[PDB]
Amino acid sequence: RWEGGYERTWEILKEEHHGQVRLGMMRHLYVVVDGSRTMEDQDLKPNRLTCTLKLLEYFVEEYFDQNPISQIGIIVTKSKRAEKLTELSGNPRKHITSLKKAVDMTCHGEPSLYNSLSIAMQTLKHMPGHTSREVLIIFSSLTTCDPSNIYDLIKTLKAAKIRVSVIGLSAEVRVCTVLARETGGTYHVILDESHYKELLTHHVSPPPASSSSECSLIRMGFPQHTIASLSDQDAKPSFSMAHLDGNTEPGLTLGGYFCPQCRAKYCELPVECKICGLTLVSAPHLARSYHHLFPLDAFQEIPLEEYNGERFCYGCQGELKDQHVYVCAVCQNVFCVDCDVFVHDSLHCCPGCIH
């Protein structure tokens, strides 16, 4: 009955560090990726699968950058089955290649969290107690099929002291919430792609060590890059043990890295020696996680008008024109917003404190 009259004339009118606590020095991380029909949804452009795997590659990059002594295993739960997409190792290149291959996969079926968790538990059953057992699960669909009781698996994980953290995509799941809370992990929910990146970056950082965490004196070796010269009579080219693992013919390299314990030859580091089990590392790899030992505390924020001092940043000599000034606790220097952000995020050290 709206047909009586209609006019728009009036519309035409003029107008987060914890305390000094022990963390996960040794990490055995397994990533669980759902492969159900819900992964084809376009919640994150273009779809969940592509954005999720790109963020996974970035996460692996950052995780290996900050945790040289960690390990990564990739599991995809598809069609109510669990498939170990990538073997547990420390190579970023293999993980990136596997993720790129999995980018063009097919998402079908339903997730089977029980089977994936069972596979992870079996894999991490034989790991040493001092090494931390961490599991990350990406849950797209809100429902899963389990051939057996999952609470028994929860008890098994609790007895094995395995930490599991889940980042759901649509909404919170009570069973996953209980699992994460009991295993000591953290449960989160994706708000957007930026929040996804934030959660992944937060999970890159080592988790605090619980009271049950062991403290054992592990022995490690640090070989040099033994390079042989063909002019020398002592130049023995030999195929890399890791390169023997592959189908392509291994490269006969003149020198490389030899195990100090059993003279095992490897072209890639830091990798634990396969023969004697010794972990062959390098000094920068150990020092790569030192910043976690001494986190950089947040500086005091005082606006420029309230700060009666130098108008030049101590970090970049830039004239302080920003509305906020960040002053250190120790040396009480002057840093602009950009320098303060970079120091806290990446540098983790104050220039005056060094001075």
């Binding site: 969290l113 429902t143 099929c145 389990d146 999952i150 909404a171 799941v173 009570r174 069973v175």
Partner: protein, 154 residues
């Protein structure tokens, strides 16, 4: 909601009649009204319009989307048992109900409380076992009387 009807019904004068408004630091409730279907069909539950197949299909589509989106706990209250049974039969004939069952498991109460109690127990166990469970009851059935929901149930 009406503070004055009860003194009239019970024929007495309560000394104090105060309603305690709820203050939330976090908005835990999202009451929404959806009277327009996917095809913009006017949604109603009048007995004249209860037999409309279009409203049945709109309800089926809404239920399917809710199961595909909302978490495991789903409860749907109809107006009468006979209308609910007719709608369920229509959905089964339409074939939408199969997709709804694929998304989340389906549970429907009946007249007998004993079998209804077993159905409710199965629904709660499915909700606690991570598999989506959907309950279909009537506003005057036993569910609205003495059945309470935990956060993951409601």
């Amino acid at each position: 909601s009406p503070l004055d009807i009860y003194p009239k019904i019970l024929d007495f004068h309560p000394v104090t009649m105060a309603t305690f408004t709820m203050t939330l630091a976090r908005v835990c409730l999202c009451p929404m009204i959806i009277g327009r279907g996917n095809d913009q069909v006017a949604i109603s539950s009048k007995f004249e319009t209860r037999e409309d197949i279009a409203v049945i299909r709109n309800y089926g589509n809404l239920l399917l989307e809710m199961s595909a989106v909302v978490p495991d706990g789903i409860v749907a209250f109809f107006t009468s048992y006979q209308y609910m049974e007719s709608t369920v039969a229509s959905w089964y004939e339409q074939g939408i109900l199969e997709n709804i069952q694929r998304n989340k498991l389906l549970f429907i109460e009946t007249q007998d409380g004993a079998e209804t109690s077993v159905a409710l127990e199965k629904y709660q166990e499915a909700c606690e076992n991570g598999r989506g469970a959907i309950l279909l009851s009537v506003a005057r059935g036993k569910v609205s009387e003495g059945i309470d929901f935990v956060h993951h149930y409601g």
